């Protein structure tokens with residue numbers, strides 16, 4: 451049967467199911483309603499940066515249509531919605547003056563969600579640094595971000611936290627560090643060779659450290675000032691793709707473990723254990739910042755739950771660890787990616803070249819965090835796959851591959867939960883086809899189709915799959 455035995459009965463009592471968007475990717479009204487620009491507005495408006503020179507000026511226009519989109523998610527039997535607040539829609543300059551029209555939007559959205567029985571899970575940040583903060587402070591290169599982010603977070607707690615009980619600070623700080631400061635392909639476009647400046651060997655580590663210190667500072671503010679009255683929770687969202695040793699050789703098994711540590715341990719060891727992974731300390735040395743005892747104690751235990759964005763898996767091949775002139779965060783891992791074993795690909799690709807469909811990676815990741823980190827509370831905060839551009843509406847709606855994707859991946863998550871993993875919830879990326887960063891509107895991740903000419907919504911087969919699976 452097309453549910454493959456899945457239903458709410460197959461998951462723990464009170465397990466949360468939701469869908470996900472992010473502000474810049476869906477809201478639109480990027481330069482209206484008092485919103486100031488983010489680094490993504492500037493980047494997207496530069497010819498050549500985004501597929502087709504597209505941007506998020508209008509996106510899906512959820513700003514005007516949010517009640518339609520909330521009605522739809524409720525009709526599909528989801529319990530929750532993960533979205534983000536645009537920092538520059540609240541503070542157009544990232545600090546100082548509040549945009550009251552921006553505040554009213556998020557109030558109206560949160561209030562409508564609650565009216566319809568949908569739980570808001572709110573990200574404070576999803577790549578969209580106010581452009582004014584980038585220009586004035588140097589963004590995440592500046593330790594002052596901890597203060598700036600904490601004052602922003604404080605405002606959001608004060609204004610929405612009587613209603614919002616489930617917060618996240620950041621989304622995929624690894625991707626910000628990697629693409630913004632190692633490869634220099636997302637804003638601020640920094641890297642060793644880059645026109646904007648940078649250093650691929652040092653800046654990614656500086657950025658990650660500042661995200662960890664800012665997270666900790668915002669959570670300390672929540673706990674000391676807001677928690678007693680509001681009784682909510684604050685976590686963080688981390689990407690984790692699975693790495694499987696290519697063979698059972700000592701060097702391949704080591705390479706796979708190195709990859710895990712440089713990918714997810716980079717953030718989880720500080721958040722769980724109060725220090726960076728030992729291998730990163732050993733290999734990155736002076737280029738890895740050192741937490742003071744006081745900082746490490748602020749960071750450790752600072753996430754009420756760990757959000758994991760889980761998409762894909764790779765095989766890892768090792769090598770003897772070499773003394774190397776430092777070049778980049780990526781090269782520091784000393785591993786070789788491999789995408790076939792025994793002459794067979796690890797899985798077929800979705801539209802995005804990096805996205806290999808490997809449902810057992812979901813089990814790998816969840817089991818791994820269970821066994822390594824003392825079984826912390828984990829929320830699967832994104833999981834999904836994309837269709838290519840230029841299909842007909844009916845081709846988009848017959849998303850048989852995405853249906854198979856969700857059934858397989860959710861079966862593997864169920865496998866890990868049944869083995870004892872402390873997973874509290876699962877969220878599909880995305881509710882709607884949207885602005886997919888460098889891919890623009892050329893990558894379709896939604897369970898709901900969006901016609902980008904007319905802005906009409908049409909639920910795909912995968913939306914109906916969820917509605918059937920999730921009926922109460």
Ligand SMILES: OC[C@H]1O[C@@H](O[C@H]2[C@H](O)[C@@H](O)[C@H](O[C@H]3[C@H](O)[C@@H](O)[C@H](O[C@H]4[C@H](O)[C@@H](O)[C@H](O)O[C@@H]4CO)O[C@@H]3CO)O[C@@H]2CO)[C@H](O)[C@@H](O)[C@@H]1O
Pocket residue numbers: 472475621622625689690691759761762780787803804832879886887895
């Ligand atoms: O895209 C959907 C959604 O997910 C969230 O972010 C995505 C990013 O949008 C996407 O760019 C990112 O891609 C990663 C990928 O996961 C890695 O596997 C891949 O690894 C590289 C490695 O860096 C190279 O050194 C090596 O040579 O090859 C491999 C490629 O096979 O690196 C890419 C970045 O290039 O994946 C994220 C999720 O993990 C966001 O939250 C959401 O907003 C996005 O829309």
Ligand SMILES: [Zn+2]
Pocket residue numbers: 511514
């Ligand atoms: Zn509109």
